RNA sequence: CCAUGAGUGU
RNA sequence: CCAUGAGUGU
RNA sequence: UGUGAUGAAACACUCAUGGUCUGAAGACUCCC
RNA sequence: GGGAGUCUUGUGAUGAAACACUCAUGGUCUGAAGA
């Protein structure tokens, strides 16, 4: 795909996933393409999750703009049905939000200072 | 551990203390600065970058840009990024000063003037770059058309009133106003009608024997050819304004499938031509939801229902589609929301510069009217 | 008519042919106005009258603004530039010694701030989008104070985003609070709390709050110093 | 005493009692009935009504219209009125059947096809003396004017937003809109412009260089044929309304002056006919009271400050006379007061009839404003 | 579909696909409609659509008009019929027998009033002025209803003076109450109540007065009967 | 004069200048043309006074077809100076109206009923 | 700007 | 419809 | 059916009629 | 400060919120159920 900018370890991946399931419990979180768009707009998200599998790809295409407008990080994940059946849903999604990470704030801190070394970051 | 930082000034290389480890200036030259200053953009480094990192070896290097790592990486170096770090700091602040010790120039005095007239002929450049884009041009045609169209119906309005003082049967009798308007502009007084002239207007013999009729049997004003010419001058107006307004479809209907042929495909070229308008460009209505698509133009409903928690319109200019306002009320949210779900995607693949999917979106969103029509 | 100096640096007074008071500025490129001003002469120099319900820094001033950061040889960051108006009278302040870069990102606007820019060597013009710092990066300095007019719902974290690029430790930011443009629903006296609480948890030193009413309706404008 | 009718059913007599003494019944004609009616608005009797009372031989007649008692008076009788009399009531209580006694109709039936037909001819007729009144087209006039007016200022701020895409220096340049359409229309691309071409429109060749620079130096964008030839249409539109403005004005001055000369006097025919299409017809401005021509087109403050005990208007459309909308604020109310009550005097000396007065009117107007400005 | 006569003559109510409820007449020219009404068959005859919110007597009968003096064969003086909307109606339910004068002064609307009153034998258009009932007096009859409905100032003493005329004794006027046009200042209430005692000073009976909202704003219709 | 309707006797045009005298002391009168038609638009006149000598007289022509259409009483006197200098003015006054007679009702009703006799009215 | 009655365009 | 900045016509 | 189900106030105009400011003061000069 | 006149003025002195448009920026519904 060339809408992903940078490449997630299949081991982040994993822990990307967890951290959404948390937050469902927890705290509050985001599901489908046109509620993240509003979510980064409003700056509600702290994370935001985008598919890598997304058929066509420019559906979510706009998020990476969005999202480094309102400079919220964004990581991916290699299933959409996976994230879908992720976030609580028994079908697939392209992206979401984590609005509130609630039991998920360790888990999620990591994640999005680990994104960052892999973006190069000091 | 070496931090580079890049300006117009030039490449200068820095410890972590903010000491100059080593620089290489810029040539003072407006020219290639600004060129350079649009590349960097992309992620392309200086000129005067690439010769300084090659007289230092740094093993870690670390500029201000996020977007040159990719490319520094390819250069052989392994590069980060530190956004707002002290080093970059440090630059600047001597940066009244450190334009003359590195001599980039004579004295304060003329690194200024130079600085003025690259900030003048940088953003010059930048002007040019925004007015060359494709869709403005489709915004600013539709937004004339609805003046046109707008225009056309006050005109036409006036017409009828004003020409029934000599001829008030008529208005009645013609619902089209380009059909009415015609009747002014080629006749004029009213006993001036003749069958032949009216059967090249299209009208079928039927009617235009209730016409000559009307105009016979007129209790209008007999009214002098000064006066006849007056109105005509409006019917003339009128007739102009519609050959005007076609010409302007067609022209908007091939920049709309030029610039935007996924949305064209979905509601036609006017309609996407009118959504661009309100979202300002193409790549500003492929970031919007659907929820926002839904009620573009409906800014009046819209924002009264956000301030009062009442009730939200179903559609903005969305409503405009043949589908929609031809439905009866409760299909058309359901419509209109499917539409919009359609319309971002088509805008998305549009501004994302993705190549024709119009007709599997069509498909898709006909079918999903017809499952709402069936209940 | 008379015109004298106020306790802020090149920034005037007059006396009127009728007994009004109306702010204005010494005239850096004489017989040309930006905006419809009017020119006056006085004393053989001419000044700028600066329009208050035009330009928010004069009704701040006009508000009980304590002390102006912007004087005589000031290097200011101008962020939302927009036609040119106010950053032509902050022209006037900082006077040839002092400069001004002015960022702005909508061309259709942008257009006659260049005919202001040009007249102008004041003023170093910047096409640009305020939420990237790192596309002006390269023409400015770091600067003394931090001028923030951007209608923006999040202008409050660009603001803060662009001080910790330019704005000198000590240095003082005046930040417009648009309130309207933040969000229509909430009240306008919920949102300036909030915002300056923000401009406080970012070490900047909160000086003074002013309400632009009724030169500016629903808007405020915060001076405070960064540390 | 004899208390005589008149109605379609011809001219009854009357005692006190209410018993029909003589009758003399009309004939069943639409054409004579109609012109009877028509006539006995301005105080004429019916020929009907001048035979009965040669057939009857009365000393004192009292008629049911005041109009018509000096007219019967001229003709040798001692006359008087009872507006809404008892016996014209008991006329009236009995005209279902009275109609059949002397004869109009056979029965009940075709009384009333009659009397139905007898309506839609006499307003068919009344119909047509309102449209030949000659102020309507006056009116009509001024109303397409400033449709004109609207559409020019609409047509022009879109094509300058439109044609700046192009050549966007152009704009500040040329202040007069008809100017800056003339030169989109004879061009189009800005690298066509030539001194000579440009000579030709009246432009000093000071100016011309500037345009010229402007153009060569112009960071617009490079743009195709068909991208121009689509905002050239407005251009021309706008140019021809200018014409048709022009022409309209010219018109209107004929007929205003024609139809109300004194108020034309006072402010000329635009304004003159503006204020004609305020108050309805020229009769309705001539009953009006200073009072409310001075306000009038200002409707929306006016009532503003009547519910809320608020200022008032000082003008309405009065604003666009010369003296006021040029003068300081402080002679504004003044001059509007002094305007407006001789523009009623102008009103009234128009509508009744009166020849030309206005050079006193304006000596006397421009008097008053003379004497206010010296304060 | 269903449709079933209603407490007052030629009036009728009708059940609706959905299940909604409009008022309708008796159509007096079948396949001819004066607005945009619908148009209804049920058992092979034809009904008009009868709204409310465009015809005011509609609107009464809605708010509870007690009863209805124009009923099958009726004699109505019909001031300010305009453009024919609600005359038209009153001519299916008079039905021939009854007949309607209808005074108007506007002739830009008689215009449209025209082409009602061909198509009806019921109604006697007339271009005239109500203030002077004189220059139709030549044309009517007395009649047994005064329906007025004229915006004019004293609208009221109008229909006095027009009752006198041709009212039958024991005759029943409607008159509609516009209260924004006899005066956008006062108080719509405190209007309805001084217009009223007008009729009772001039001797009418107050049966039933009815408030025309949300059919009508600003309007109330009164029924009285003329002695 | 043309706007004159009808023939005003001196004896009778004393009684008006006198019922106006003491409808300014005792009621409320309005004085002026423009005053006056704004009383009759609003339907506030009881009686409407006129003079004979307006130049030019198309500006009082218009209070006869005024005074009909609301149906108030109109009466004309002799000279406008006269008319004025009644209304406790020292300049002329081309017409003006009583709205509310006071201590001359009985005045006015005699006026109103004598210009009616004249008129032909039974 | 209020009310009433009649209509128009995308 | 709200707020800010730049303008136009009678 | 999260590639958006359910709920849910699209926008621009014309004509006709009525409601249509205040009401007697302002400016100058000459005598001690 | 007292007195005294002159011109303008109910054919209107004094007081007093005329109307119509364009551009640019942001604030731009709901969210898992439906046959
Ligand atoms: N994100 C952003 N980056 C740069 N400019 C922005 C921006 N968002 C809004 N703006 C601009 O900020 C301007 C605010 S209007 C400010 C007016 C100006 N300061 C004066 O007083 O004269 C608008 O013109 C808008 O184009
Ligand atoms: N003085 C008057 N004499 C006769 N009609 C008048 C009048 N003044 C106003 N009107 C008319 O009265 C009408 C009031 S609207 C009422 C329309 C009609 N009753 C209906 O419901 O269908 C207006 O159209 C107006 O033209």
């Given at each position: 795909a060339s809408y992903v900018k940078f490449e997630v370890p299949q081991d982040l991946a994993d822990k990307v996933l967890e951290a959404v399931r948390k937050a469902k419990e927890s705290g509050k979180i985001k599901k489908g393409t046109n509620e993240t768009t509003k979510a980064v707009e409003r700056g509600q998200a702290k994370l935001v999750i985008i598919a890598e599998d997304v058929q066509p790809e420019e559906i979510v295409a706009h998020l990476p703009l969005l999202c480094d407008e309102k400079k919220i990080p964004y990581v991916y994940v290699s299933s959409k049905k996976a994230l879908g059946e992720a976030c609580g849903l028994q079908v697939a999604t392209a992206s979401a939000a984590i609005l509130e990470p609630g039991e998920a704030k360790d888990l999620v801190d990591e994640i999005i200072k680990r994104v960052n070394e892999i973006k190069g970051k000091? | ?286 970031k919007m939801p659907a929820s ?45 929301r499917?539409?919009?779900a359609?319309?971002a995607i088509?805008?998305r ?27 | ?153 999040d202008?409050?974290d ?70």
């Amino acid at each position: 795909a060339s809408y992903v900018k940078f490449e997630v370890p299949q081991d982040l991946a994993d822990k990307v996933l967890e951290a959404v399931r948390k937050a469902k419990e927890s705290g509050k979180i985001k599901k489908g393409t046109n509620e993240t768009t509003k979510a980064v707009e409003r700056g509600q998200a702290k994370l935001v999750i985008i598919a890598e599998d997304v058929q066509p790809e420019e559906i979510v295409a706009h998020l990476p703009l969005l999202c480094d407008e309102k400079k919220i990080p964004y990581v991916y994940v290699s299933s959409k049905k996976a994230l879908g059946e992720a976030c609580g849903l028994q079908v697939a999604t392209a992206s979401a939000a984590i609005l509130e990470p609630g039991e998920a704030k360790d888990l999620v801190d990591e994640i999005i200072k680990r994104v960052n070394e892999i973006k190069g970051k000091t | 551990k070496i931090y580079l930082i890049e300006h117009v000034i030039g490449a200068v290389a820095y410890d972590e203390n903010g000491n100059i480890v080593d620089y290489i200036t810029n040539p003072r030259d407006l020219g290639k600065i600004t060129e350079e200053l649009l590349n960097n953009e992309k992620g392309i480094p200086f000129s005067a970058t690439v010769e300084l990192l090659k007289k230092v070896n740094p093993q870690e290097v670390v500029v201000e840009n996020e977007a040159e790592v990719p490319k520094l990486q390819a250069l052989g170096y392994r590069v980060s990024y530190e956004p707002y770090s002290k080093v970059s700091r440090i630059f600047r602040e001597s940066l009244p000063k450190v334009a003359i010790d590195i001599k980039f120039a004579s004295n304060e005095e003329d690194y200024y003037n130079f600085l003025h007239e690259l900030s003048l002929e940088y953003t010059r450049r930048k002007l040019r770059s925004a007015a060359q884009k494709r869709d403005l041009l489709a915004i600013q045609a539709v937004r004339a058309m609805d003046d046109i169209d707008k225009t056309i119906n006050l005109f036409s309005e006036r017409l009828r009133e004003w020409y029934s003082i000599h001829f008030p049967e008529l208005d009645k009798l013609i619902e089209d106003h380009e059909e009415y308007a015609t009747i002014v502009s080629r006749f004029g007084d009213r006993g001036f009608l003749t069958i032949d002239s009216l059967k090249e207007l299209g009208f079928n013999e039927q009617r235009i024997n209730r016409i000559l009729d009307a105009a016979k049997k007129s209790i209008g004003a007999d009214i002098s050819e000064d006066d006849l010419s007056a109105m005509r001058m409006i019917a003339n107006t009128i007739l102009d304004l519609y050959n005007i307004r076609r010409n302007l479809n067609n022209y908007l209907e091939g920049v709309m499938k030029e610039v935007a042929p996924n949305v064209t495909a979905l509601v036609g070229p006017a309609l996407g031509a009118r959504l661009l308008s309100i979202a300002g460009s193409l790549d500003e209505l492929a970031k919007m939801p659907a929820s926002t698509i839904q009620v573009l133009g409906a800014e009046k409903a819209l924002f009264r229902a956000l301030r009062s928690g009442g009730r939200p319109p179903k559609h903005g200019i969305i409503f405009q589609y043949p589908a929609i306002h031809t439905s009866p009320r409760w299909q058309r949210g359901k419509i209109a929301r499917a539409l919009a779900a359609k319309l971002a995607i088509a805008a998305r693949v549009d501004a994302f510069s993705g190549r024709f999917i119009g007709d599997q979106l069509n498909e898709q969103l006909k079918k999903r009217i017809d499952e709402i029509k069936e209940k | 008519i008379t015109v004298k100096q106020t306790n802020m640096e090149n920034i005037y007074e007059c006396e009127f042919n009728d007994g009004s008071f109306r702010l204005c500025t010494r005239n850096l490129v004489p017989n040309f106005n930006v905006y419809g001003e009017r020119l006056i002469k006085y004393e053989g120099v001419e000044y700028r009258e600066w329009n208050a319900f035009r330009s928010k820094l004069a009704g701040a001033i006009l508000k009980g603004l304590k002390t102006n950061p912007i004087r005589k040889g000031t290097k200011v960051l101008y962020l939302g530039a927009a036609s040119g108006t106010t950053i032509s009278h902050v022209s006037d302040i900082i006077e040839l010694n002092g400069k001004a870069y002015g960022v702005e990102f909508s061309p259709r606007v942008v257009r006659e701030l260049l005919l202001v820019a040009q007249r102008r060597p004041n003023i170093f013009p910047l096409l640009a989008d305020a939420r990237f710092p790192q596309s002006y990066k390269s023409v400015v300095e770091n600067v003394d104070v931090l001028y923030v007019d951007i209608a923006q719902p999040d202008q409050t974290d660009i603001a803060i985003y662009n001080a910790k690029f330019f704005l000198k430790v000590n240095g003082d930011m005046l930040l417009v609070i648009k309130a309207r443009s933040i969000d229509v629903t909430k009240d306008p006296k919920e949102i300036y709390k909030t915002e300056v609480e923000k401009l406080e948890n970012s070490n900047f030193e909160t000086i003074q709050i002013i309400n632009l009413d009724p030169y500016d309706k629903d808007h405020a404008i915060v001076l405070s110093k960064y540390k």
